[PDB]
Amino acid sequence: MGPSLDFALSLLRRNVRQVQTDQGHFTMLGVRDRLAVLPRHSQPGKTIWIEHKLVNILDAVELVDEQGVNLELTLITLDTNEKFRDITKFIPENISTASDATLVINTEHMPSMFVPVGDVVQYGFLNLSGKPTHRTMMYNFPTKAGQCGGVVTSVGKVIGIHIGGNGRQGFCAGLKRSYFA
């Protein structure tokens, strides 16, 4: 088996979880230790269903940039015995574009799903449901409902978390390593 298929399959196995909040089904990325990241519009509450059980959330931080502009990411700390394989080393230090990226989705409705989104490009500003958002990236792939939280990956790098779309395009919140320091 090849390095790319191996990497993304290993991401599914170790780090990318099927979740449900009161807002529906999402993909969650476990980053290290008890720390995971969700799209802000998943709105996690005091507890979260991850795969086959309810897990308590110890803390939730909805990230903003230096101007207090929404980044569309929520950082959660889980009450779990599991320590996620640390993948912060696969996250760029700065928000990075990519070529021929893959979007890896994992929900009860879309389990272990691989979507070739192609090139990920700098976008910056977006209005997300009257919510204005910075540090976004864009791909020209008609994404659909249910793929939010999907993990944007390319050549052993984890660069974004799917945040929305418009019927021809997809948009992710860019990841940087410093969010998980």
Q: Could you tell me if 181 and 146 are in contact, meaning their C-beta atoms sit under 8 angstroms apart? A: no
Q: Which two tokens stand for residue 60?
A: 């939730």
Burial class (CB in 10 A: 0-12, 13-18, 19+), 173: buried
Determine the Cα angle at 70 with ends 64 and 76, to 5°: 65
Q: What is the resolution of this structure in A?
A: 2.0
User: How far apart are alpha carbons 88 and 20 in whole angstroms?
Assistant: 24
125, 65 in Cβ contact below 8 A?
no
Residue length of the chain: 181
In which region does residue 129 sit, left (phi positive, over 0), alpha (psi from -120 to 50) or beta (all else)? left
**Nearest 5°: CA angle at 175, between 169 and 176?**
150
Cα 24 from Cα 107, distance rounded (Å): 10
Contacts of 96 (CB under 8 A, 6+ apart): 157, 159, 174
Strand ranges (E), 22-82: 24-32, 35-39, 47-50, 53-64, 70-79
Is 148 one of the annotated active-site residues of the chain?
yes
Q: Which of 41, 134, 162, 172 is catalytic?
A: 41
Nearest to 78 by CA among 102, 56, 105: 56
Domain ranges of the chain: 1-15+85-181, 16-84
Topology match between the domains 1-15+85-181 and 16-84: yes
**Maximum Cα–Cα distance for the chain, whole Å?**
45
Pick the CATH number of 16-84 from 3.60.15.10, 2.60.120.10, 1.10.40.50, 2.40.10.10: 2.40.10.10
Distance CA 167, CA 74 (A): 24
Catalytic annotation present for 162: no
What are phi and psi for residue 6, nearest 5 degrees?
-65, -50
The two three-digit tokens of residue 18, written as one number? 């099927």
DSSP 100-140: EEEEEE--SSSTTEEEEEEEEEEEEEEEETTEEEEEEEEES
Residue 24 pairs in a beta bridge with 21
Question: CA torsion angle for 19, 21, 26, 31 (degrees, to 10)?
Answer: -60
Is residue 82 annotated as part of the catalytic site, yes or no? no
Catalytic residue, candidates 25, 52, 66, 148: 148
What is the amino acid identity at position 116? P
C-alpha distance across the termini of the chain, in Å: 33
* 111-140 burial: b if 16+ Cβ within 10 Å, else e: eebbbebbebeebeebebeeeebbbbbbbe
Q: Which of 25, 62, 66, 72 is catalytic?
A: 72
So what CATH class is 1-15+85-181?
A: mainly beta
Distance CA(16)–CA(31), nearest Å, equals 9
